[PDB]
Design a protein around this ligand. Structure first.
Ligand SMILES: Nc1ncnc2c1ncn2[C@@H]1O[C@H](COP(=O)(O)OP(=O)(O)OP(=O)(O)O)[C@@H](O)[C@H]1O
Ligand SMILES: Nc1ncnc2c1ncn2[C@@H]1O[C@H](COP(=O)(O)OP(=O)(O)OP(=O)(O)O)[C@@H](O)[C@H]1O
Lengths: 489, 489, 489, 489
């Protein structure tokens, strides 16, 4: 196991433009606080519209025809991404420590999950660089028709506080592999790993202006990016409400392309013939992973009547044994919630459960009267009309609903405006495939949960998003199709 | 040559929902007028939000799991699209006549261009129905991962007045081949071919509710479609201003997927080494086709200084010899403009060209005093700052500009916020490919103009659009990607 | 049900070259006899090397640059195949009757299985004609690299007696859709449907020389095709021994490309958790379909010990009720075997079973002392070392073997030099996917048998063949890849 | 520039099986000689059929289900290929020196051409490992159909003496990225780089038996590989005569899949409108690269009559100035021929050119009386009937032929039984694309020569080969397609 870095000094705190560090144009700065201790970590330069303008102009110059970035052969863009992955691997412990300090997630989770995801995603897209292929299309005997899959141009990337570096890398890896330039805006709560990544981008050898990073607030920096007349594409991960604002501003300004990865009301369907211990363990990790602060979180655990009582019993047992505490301690599986507004929202939803008729099986309150920790909570006798079964909790709360038939559970699982993920637990071939086909979700897991691969696309149906991240499908978000039609005389 | 149907009676004027004809819920009707005779053709039912709600509910019921449309095998949807193409070919004369009546385009142009495009597009996408393939993705030894390219659901289609049936078919053909259901809104100026197509959809055997058609106005029917919470995707063709409103309405409502095909400020570049007579004939058809009312119309004809004078001279001969008159006459190459608003807009721009310093080479005024016909107009000595060079004329006006170097003409051609099409005329291999690569346009034609194929994608860069129509690329706009990841125990 | 044509006169009996009918160069003729009655049907022209030379020269002329076939646009080759499918549909009863007379298979099987397969295959490949796309490959900033998927040229097609027309159409549909020309050789036992198809090819409008048909014997016509210096590709379906000779002659002569579809020793694995009645019915159809004369025939039925005795009992019941008799009679499910050498081989293998220790559960002898009919036979207590479990019977004999574990049955099923098809019967998700992954077979059916689709590739692993027929994969057998690399100055 | 290793000691001379070094079962050894010094370099173990049987059994054990190689995830095979590329780059100087010692090619050519190709090919295919994707195919509402692109199994690789390491890497890179295991046979003249690569395969961490190397002769080791019943695929590069023997042996034995990369009679067409100096430099490197010992060598330089005399004149200057000598010297562009047999064959053809009427413009004899060096030779007035135009010289002889029209030169260029490469020099767009389409060659270069990319497929039409090497196309040669069709109950 890697040794934790409990007292790490943050070195990178400025705006990154043209491979140089800059103070904000206004001189303003903002603080980032450690959610575990509640103390201030450091001050970071606070960007605004003039800093975004400078970042966009640097990205435009780096993207113009004839530039060192545009002239690189396809395989050299791949080599640059591999070198970046090598540096992320070399500085893996430092990056994980910065993520633990900023988010409160356990150091070993940031090391083995977030950083592993970053490295695998960078290596995967490094391999696509010389494999982005268009088509030659048969038309007429005297015509030569083909398509080019060109880079779009300047890509904005706006990311959230729950998986800061990973959500950034999910955008940067396909964007750079396709030949685009970028302006990145990490969440104001979590700017540290993004700024450290900027130092690795320069050391890896990327030409200046290819990647630019402007820390700051959503309505200031984020809105300057979404409305920018010279940004050609935006990729956003965060709340559905902010995703709607970003896409509206993009449409109002220059019709820039927009990919959105938003929330979900994700179901977890446990059939009577499931491997019950596997279903209990996966639905537990599904609800409680990252303190329940994950877009993939299970928010509705539907269990067939035949195994309902036993499933609740084993779930209550798992929830009570989960070690909650200091993220740097090796034993910890659950750190604190990110902030007060998030924490208070969870407790208000927990209170709503008892009042509406759900049976509080365990937890249901804070761990201590000072910290941001909530005790792993489980509710049984949950019905569809309840608040704990309709609203995204984003916390450690497991609502367990009962069902009788497959046709019934398909209708109930799909009765939401969302569709990010779904999970099915059954040993039966036909039920597994029938449910995988019928569930309106971007990812359907069978007999597993949170099984992500850099080669498998991820994204939402309905209000859970537009477009896909990961896999070959990610390339379509970062390229523009040009048809060239030549008529021979 | 097919005989012109100069006195065709209109049979279909109602709202089409569940394969039945309905009056508008309000009882209101609007008139459609013939731009050649300036007389009313008929009254069509005027839809509003209640009619759109009824059409959407029919489309949702036809898309629900277990419906006859959803249970058809892949090859059977192809058979349906092929039968629809056979009916369009059988009724080709009636449809071309209805299109000439509504738009003023020559009958032979509607017959051999619009209708040929319709038939070819339907047959091409009929062939894709059993060829929409997802992927099997290698992950780990104990994992089976694959993608399904599922239909999106209810698709809205909002089309313009210049190529009414063709723009509708460009959306209907891939939508139905992918298994979606639809709500169509033809332009208020041109509803007749859309309603006749509804009668053919029923005759072809499409289950009720698979295609629904609601004639009416933009802020009423169109806005109800763009904002509907049960429409999952919208495809729009029309102006950049309205495309922005449609996309903002989509974002604000349910984040429905949006394809936009908008205007352009399309360059036509003629090099000194070009086959001059070929370039003259192509740039002439490129400006004057469909009375200049084309999204692909060349808005700036850039001609190299060495051949400028001769290009201008031959272009004037073509414009002066272009036959303008009754669209039902075999000799007619240019009919009237769509309406008085369009006609006055074109004359205002012609007047503006004279006032800003361009040399009026021919035309420059209306053909008569009581019609909507405009004399084919050519302007030389045009500069980039002029209104006739900066604005989309959407009329029979050819602005001819002069250039000296390739690098200069690339900068000038790309200086726009648009990027729909571009055309290049040169005999030099390196020059043709360098321009094909450097021009920021969705389609680049070389030694041809308006060369479209059902198998070649079409769409814009920048503010000319989002997404593609035609080719294999159209399928991505009408399907939603689902990852299924199975962990073997 | 279609009315049978018991006394149909065969109209087409000559060599088909350049859309004209010719007598053989030698004047020689051969007879085709009805295997049901044992009487002569008619005489057919007997081709040899000079008739193959004339057919190849006609195919070469039809393939040369500038020819009417080479100049057709991609979509028109698709239209021609659709018209051919329409004619095959129009003359479906006549074609099925010719196939029943030649092969002895029931009229309703030829009508609803063989002819349905022909029509679906022609329609499917008609849709690929304008969708055969190469690639544009990113290399260097100053390079334009792309691939063309060109037709190969003259394609020979050699087919067997068990599914005469279907095996021919599996080759002709992708060959013509890709733009190739052809020389067809049907089996000497079954030339009638191929010659009738020649009349439909001319009526459909294919240019002369695009398809040429030379009936005759294997060592004469077949060997002239396989060794021909001007045939560029051969596709063969038949025995492994003859497939080896064809590929050797192809390599010795001009290295012409060769696709082979050969025999198999196909296993059918029934797990204890299977739907037993479904497994019994599918393994019954799997063994006894087309009188056991099918490359897909189940030759080893492995049944798990827990359900072994019950599976044997229900199988014996199904075998005893199968109606054997006149192919034109509506009730008949099993006609006669094709010929004496085939029939005697079956009886010799049946005799070997009793002698080696297998338990003859039912049948085991001829139906009558005059005809070519064999009684549906089932053997239990079959072991791997036995002749009935190692050699391809090509008859109505069901060897039932017992197994205890999945790992054991994988090893035993894969212990053959063949690998055409496999079938698995289980309700368990994990076993179904583990077996589908581990079985070395070109097609793995789960809970079904003989489930073929024009869109799903079919072909063998190991000595069961080289290449694939059907699906998008079929196009790779009928195209040659050309890389065009252009360096810009 | 890298320092030449003029006295490198050979470390690896043994048979490589299961990551260990073995003596030949017979104890026999054969000598490898340096063509520059004409002295023995060392003795290498001489394999035979027993060594091939041992290597095949090791490869089969390493490919068996559950082996460490088979259980590695897709991305881990990519990591292994990348590590192998890093070791080849680290030992680049040693490998280039070993290649110069065995072949006589200049050290800098081996370093910047052969070794660069090796590294680029390994890195390209390392990127394909987790991107080999099958398809999900739409069939019926109750069917789940998909394809898997499985590894074929044990792959044999038989390579020639002209580009020893590069031809081996062209097979190894896609074979291993697809998950296959291998048995390699380098040419008897050039075994040293293959055995050094074996030491790097072990160092990189490939499990034992994944790559096995057996040096030896063709009719002994090569024939044992081509006829082996447990080798599932063979890839061969070399002469057309031997490729035929290999393919016939494959057919006769177990129908193992065969890729062939054979000789060519490659045309180089220079039009009157070409950049003459570019065409002279390209056709010179195209004939003289690697002492003329290239499968891509231009065998007929067709020059348009209008520029014929000037082309001949400038070509002679290039040939007379080409530095011939010690390959370890920085200035050397042409080393010795491979052996006495090759050297005498070239001189016999040079003598034949003089006797048949060609004008000897320069060279025409050996450089000295004791070496294997030949003076760069140019012949003008060459006609199609001559031996120097009809036969593959495989030496430094440039035959320059004259042509008048495009149609004439297309007929003459395609009159061969071969079709590996073609090159065209013209500034005209239509001429370049018409020739690219009409020339029957696997690769058509336009305004360049020998422009190869790891991402661009390479192979022949007609008797120049079967299948492709490089690009995505190479994956199809190293995978076997499996259709899995699941019927839901
Ligand atoms: N108006 C905006 N325009 C653009 N970006 C914004 C805007 N508002 C927020 N963002 C940015 O979007 C990203 C995601 O923020 P997010 O939607 O998750 O808000 P949140 O505070 O985390 O959620 P919540 O308010 O539901 O608790 C961050 O980088 C944030 O700064
Ligand atoms: N030597 C040959 N060369 C080429 N084609 C041949 C040759 N021998 C047979 N054929 C042809 O190949 C096709 C398939 O014949 P096939 O291999 O099935 O022989 P068969 O008589 O049916 O089998 P079996 O001898 O095992 O009972 C037929 O069209 C046949 O005429």
């Amino acid at each position: 196991l890697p040794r934790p870095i409990r007292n790490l000094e943050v070195k990178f705190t400025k705006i990154f433009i043209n491979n140089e560090w800059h103070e904000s144009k206004s001189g303003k700065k903002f603080a980032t606080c450690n959610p575990s201790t509640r103390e201030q970590i450091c001050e970071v330069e606070e960007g605004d519209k003039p800093d975004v303008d400078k970042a966009v102009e640097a990205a435009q110059v780096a993207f113009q025809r004839g530039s060192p970035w545009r002239r690189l052969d396809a395989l050299s863009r791949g080599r640059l991404l591999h070198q970046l992955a090598d540096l992320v691997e070399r500085d893996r412990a430092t990056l994980a420590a910065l993520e633990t300090m900023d988010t409160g997630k356990p150091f070993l989770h940031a090391f083995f999950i977030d950083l592993e995801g970053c490295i695998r995603t960078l290596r995967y897209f490094a391999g696509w660089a010389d494999k982005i292929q268009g088509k030659t299309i048969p038309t007429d005997d005297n015509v030569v028709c083909f398509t080019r899959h060109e880079p779009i141009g300047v890509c904005g990337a706006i990311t959230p506080w729950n998986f800061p570096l990973l959500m950034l890398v999910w955008k940067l890896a396909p964007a750079l592999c396709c030949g685009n330039t970028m302006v990145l805006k990490p969440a104001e709560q979590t700017p540290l790993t993004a700024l450290y990544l900027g130092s690795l981008i320069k050391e890896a050898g990327f030409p200046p202006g290819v990647v630019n990073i402007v820390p700051g607030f959503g309505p200031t920096v984020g809105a300057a990016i979404s409305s920018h007349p010279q940004i050609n594409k935006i990729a956003f991960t965060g709340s559905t409400e902010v995703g709607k604002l970003v896409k509206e501003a993009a449409s109002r300004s220059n019709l820039k392309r927009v990919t959105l990865e938003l929330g979900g009301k994700n179901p977890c369907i446990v059939c009577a013939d499931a491997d019950l211990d596997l279903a209990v363990e996966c639905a537990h990790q599904g609800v409680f992973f990252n303190q329940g602060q994950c877009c993939t979180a299970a928010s509705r655990v539907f269990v067939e009547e035949q195994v309902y009582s036993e499933f609740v019993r084993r779930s209550v047992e798992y929830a009570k044994k989960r070690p909650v505490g200091d993220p740097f301690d090796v034993k910890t599986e659950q750190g604190p919630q990110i902030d007060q507004k998030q924490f208070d929202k969870i407790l208000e939803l927990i209170e709503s459960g008892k009042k509406e008729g759900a049976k509080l099986e365990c937890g249901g309150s804070a761990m201590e009267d000072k910290g941001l920790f909530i005790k792993p909570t489980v509710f049984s006798e949950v019905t569809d009309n309840m608040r704990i079964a309709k609203e995204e909790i984003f916390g450690p709360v497991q609502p367990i609903l009962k069902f009788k038939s497959i046709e019934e559970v398909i209708k109930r699982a799909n009765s939401t405006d969302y569709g990010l993920t779904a999970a099915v637990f059954t040993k039966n071939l036909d039920k597994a495939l029938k449910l995988a086909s019928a569930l309106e979700s971007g990812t359907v897991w069978i007999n597993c949960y949170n099984a992500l691969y850099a080669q498998a696309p991820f994204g939402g149906f309905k209000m859970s998003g537009n477009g896909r991240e990961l896999g070959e499908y990610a390339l379509a978000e970062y390229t523009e199709v040009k048809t060239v039609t030549i008529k021979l005389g």
